[PDB]
Design a protein around this ligand. Sequence first.
Ligand code: NA
Lengths: 101, 481, 482
Amino acid sequence: IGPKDQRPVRFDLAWQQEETNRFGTDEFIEYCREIGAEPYISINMGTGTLDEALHWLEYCNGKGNTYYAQLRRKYGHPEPYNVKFWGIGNEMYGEWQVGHM
Amino acid sequence: SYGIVVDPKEVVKPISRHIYGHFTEHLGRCIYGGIYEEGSPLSDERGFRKDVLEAVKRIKVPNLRWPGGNFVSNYHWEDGIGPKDQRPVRFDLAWQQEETNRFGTDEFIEYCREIGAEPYISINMGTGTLDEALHWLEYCNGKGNTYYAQLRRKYGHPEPYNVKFWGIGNEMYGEWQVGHMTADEYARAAKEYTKWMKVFDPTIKAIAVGCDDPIWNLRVLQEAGDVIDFISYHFYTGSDDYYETVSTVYLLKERLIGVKKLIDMVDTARKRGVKIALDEWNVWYRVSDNKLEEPYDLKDGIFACGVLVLLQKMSDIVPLANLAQLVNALGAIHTEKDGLILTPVYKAFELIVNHSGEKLVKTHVESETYNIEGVMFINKMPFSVENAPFLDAAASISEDGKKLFIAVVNYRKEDALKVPIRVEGLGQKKATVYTLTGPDVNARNTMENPNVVDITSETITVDTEFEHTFKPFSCSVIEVE
Amino acid sequence: SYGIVVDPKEVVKPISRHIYGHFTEHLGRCIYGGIYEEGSPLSDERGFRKDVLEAVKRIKVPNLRWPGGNFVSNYHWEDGIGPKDQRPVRFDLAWQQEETNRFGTDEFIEYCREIGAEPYISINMGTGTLDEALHWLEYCNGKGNTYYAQLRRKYGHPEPYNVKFWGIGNEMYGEWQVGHMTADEYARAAKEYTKWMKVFDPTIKAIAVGCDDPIWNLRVLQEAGDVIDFISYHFYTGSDDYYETVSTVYLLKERLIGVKKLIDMVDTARKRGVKIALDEWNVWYRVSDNKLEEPYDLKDGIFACGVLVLLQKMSDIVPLANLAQLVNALGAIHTEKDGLILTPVYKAFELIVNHSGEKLVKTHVESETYNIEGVMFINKMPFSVENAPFLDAAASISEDGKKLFIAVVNYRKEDALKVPIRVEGLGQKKATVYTLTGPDVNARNTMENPNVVDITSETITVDTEFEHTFKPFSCSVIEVEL
Ligand code: NA
C-alpha cells in the first residue's frame, strides 16, 4: 500500500520470487471494480497476526476515524471497499505452507 | 606399555579445519572491553583492540560464533545496524547489562574479515520470529533487490557477506533461556526456521540445538533431520583436581559417541549425514556471575590440548567445534585496560593450530590407562571415566604431503614418559619438537610474567624408530620433514 | 595387511558364559517332533528325543529360553502343569496351532536339568496378568508354604527350580504380538511386573523388551531402569548374497553399541549397570510361514561364527544371548521322524563352545576392510556397513590359564589367507587347529550326507611368531597349551 515507489521488495517463500508489491490491496480492489467482481481476500495466518488481519479489515471496511480507515482515505479512497468474503488462512494443514498448523 | 606407531602413507580421513573454531558472546567483557573498545589507546579506529587482534590472528580462527549464547535469545539484530549513534540501548535479560548495540552485525562481519574467520551467526528463537531470522539472512546473504539486501548496501557493503553457518537457536531446552521450549516445540520450530531459511539460501549450513536429554535430541533429529546439517552439544567441565579435569576429555569422547549413535537411530538424519557441532566447550567451574572471568591454569590448558587431539581423530563425526569463549568470558585471552594475558587454554590453540596437518594418518598408541570418579562444572556434578589413557596422540600430514605432525599429550601428572616411536618408512632426519608445559599443573600467565606457560622448541634427530621423553602435564608436536 | 597379535598375559575382561544361550519356542516342530516326541523309537521314557539330546549336550547350553517368542504372549502357564491327560488343548494365536500342553513347565525344567542349562522363562504380558506371572514365579522358585510352591511339590518336585532369568514380556512393541502395547504402556507395565516379582524373589534377573525404536528403548530404561537387569534386542538377518549376509555381524555390532549408549544416557540404568540381552538372533530371510524351517547353509554358519566372536569381544555389554532357535524353527538342528541334521549354524556353536576360554586376552587384528550396501531379513530391508573386516579374531584363555584359544574368522569369499600370528612369550610347540569349513558358501548338511559341512582338526607347530593358512568362508580355533 501507499506510493508504489516506496513499497518494499520482498522475497516470497512460496514461489521463490522477488515481489515488488506494485500490485497491492488498492490495485486489486480497483481491478475488482473494473470487472464488477466482489473481492475475496485471504489473510496471512502463517507469518501474520490477529492485529495484522484486523488492520487489513479496518483498512478495507472501516467507516470511522481509526488509523487504517483514515489511511485508506489518505491513499485516495474515502469510501470503504466493503470486502464481504474473507479467507481465514490458506491450506494451513499442509507442511508446504509457511507456519502450517 | 607405552608407544606410538605412525604410518604417514595411510591417510585415515581429512581433518575438518572447523574443529578449531571460536565464539564471542555479548557477555561481560567479551565484546565490550574484550575484542571491541572504543577509545582504548590499544584499539584501532574501528574500535578493535589491536593487541587482541594480533593474538587472534596467531591462532588462525576458521570460524567465529556470535552473538550468543544466552544473549541471542533476547537479541533483535536490527537494533545493531545503521549509524551507531541511532542504535537503541537495550536491556539484555541474559546477563543483565545495558547493551548499546555499538558492536552489531556489520562490525562483527568486519571483525571476521580482519581475522580471516568464517562468520557463524546464531539466531534468536526466544523473542525472535521466522520473519526476523529470514531478514537477517537476507541482509547478510541477499544479492537481489529485496529490502534487506539493499539495506546492507545502503549501510556500506554492496557485496553479500555469505554467512555459511547459522545456529538455529541457543540452548532452547534450558529454563534459563528467554522463551525456552519443550522438545516437541523446539523440534517443530527448528524444522520451520531451517526449511524456510534454506528456501532463501540453500547453501547455508544449519546447526540445531542438542543437549544431554536423549529424548530432546531424538525429537530434533526426527522432526528436522531432513533439513539440518548439525546437532549441537555444549560441554563444560573441570574441578580443582588435575586428573578430574583432564580425564574428562574421555568423558567428552563418550558423550560425542552417544550423540552420533542417536543420529544413527534416525533414518532421515543418518542418510543425510547429519553431524555434531561441539559449538560451546571449555573448562568452567570456578566462577558463577555475569562476567565468567575463569582463571585458567595449565591443568585447564592440558584439557584443551586433549580435546583438540580428540577432535583431530573424530572430526568426521564432529566437524565443527567452538571454544567458549575467545576473550574474557570463559576467556582464552584475558584483557585489562593496558594489556592482555594469553591463558594456557589459548596456548593449546597456539600450539596445535600452528603445528597440525589437514589429513589424519594412521596412528596406533600403546598406553597405560586409569579409571576415575570425580566432579565437574559449576554444580560439581559427579562423573566417572573408565580407561582414560595417560598418553594420547594423533599424527597428521600437510595437504601437500611434505610435513608430518605428531601431536602427543602426556597427561601423567607425576612422571615424564620415555616413549618409543615408530614412523613407517621414515629416513633419518632432524625434526622440531614444540612443547607446551609449565612449572606445575596450576601455573598461569600474568601481565608481568606472560610466559610462565608457553611453547618452547628443541631440535631432535628422528628415524623410522626413535625415542623421545615427554614431560609430565605437557602437550608436544613433533614436526617432521 | 593381515596379521594377528595376541598377548596371553594381558586379560582384558571375563567372557560371560551366557553368550552361548539357546531358545526353544512352541513354534512348528521345535518342541513337538523336535526336542520332544512322545512314543518315538528315538525318544526316552520322558519323551525326549535322544539323538537331539546328544547333539544338544555336545554344545554345552548355558541357558535355555522358553516358551516364546510370540507364543508366550497368549500362553497361560497353568495350562501346562499337572497330570498330562488333564491339560487342556489350546489354540495358539501366534502360530495358529492346537497346543496340547503336554510339554509344560515341569518338562521344560527337566529338559534344562538333563542338558545342564539354566532355565530362562519369558512371561505372558499379552493376555497374562501380574498375579499370573507371580504365580509362575512362586511355582518355580517358592520354598515356603504358599499354594503354588506346594503345587510344585504335589506334582513331584519338592526342591524349587530356582529359575534365575525372567523375560518381562516378548516383542510387546509389535502389532503382531497378542496384546501389544505402546512404549509408555509397556514401560509402565515392565516396571510393575519387575518390581513385584522381585519383592517375591529379589535374586531373579529381569530382561525387559527393547527394539530398534530409540524412544521405546528410552521409555523402558527411564521408567524401569531402577529394577530391570537387561534390555533385550532381537536381530534377524541375511540375504542370498554371501557378503550381504556375513557383513551384518558388523551391523549388529553398531546396533549393540547404540543400545549400550542409550543405557548410558539414563542415569538409573547406567548406575545400575543394566546390560543388553541379545535374546533372539539368527539368519532368517527365506521362509515366512508357521514352521520357519530355514535351510541354513555355510554362509549362515559363518555369520553365526562371526557373532560368537563378536560376543566374546563384547560380553561385558551383552552378557546374555540366545540363538533363535535350537530345533526346527529357525533351527540349528533339523529333525525328521527317523534322524536329524546338524546345520552349519549348529556347527558354529559346536566349534566355539568347545574351544573357547573364560577370559578374553589382548588381541590386535590387522585386516583389509570393505563397505557394503545390501538387504536383510524376510522383508529385504536395506542396510549398509562401513569398513567390515575380511578377517577377525578373538583370543581367550581358560580359567586355570593352561589353554589359549585363538578364534579366527576368514570372511573372504574366494581366497584363503596366509596370516602371520604373534603370541607373546609362547614357546616352540605343537597345537591343534579346529576348522569349520565346507566346499562352497551354499553348502549344507543333509540326512544322506550329514558331514558336508563339518569341523576338521589338524596339528600345527606354533611359536612366538608363526603362520597359518585360513580357508575362505571359514572359522578356526587354534588351541594351544600354555
Ligand atoms: Na539382582
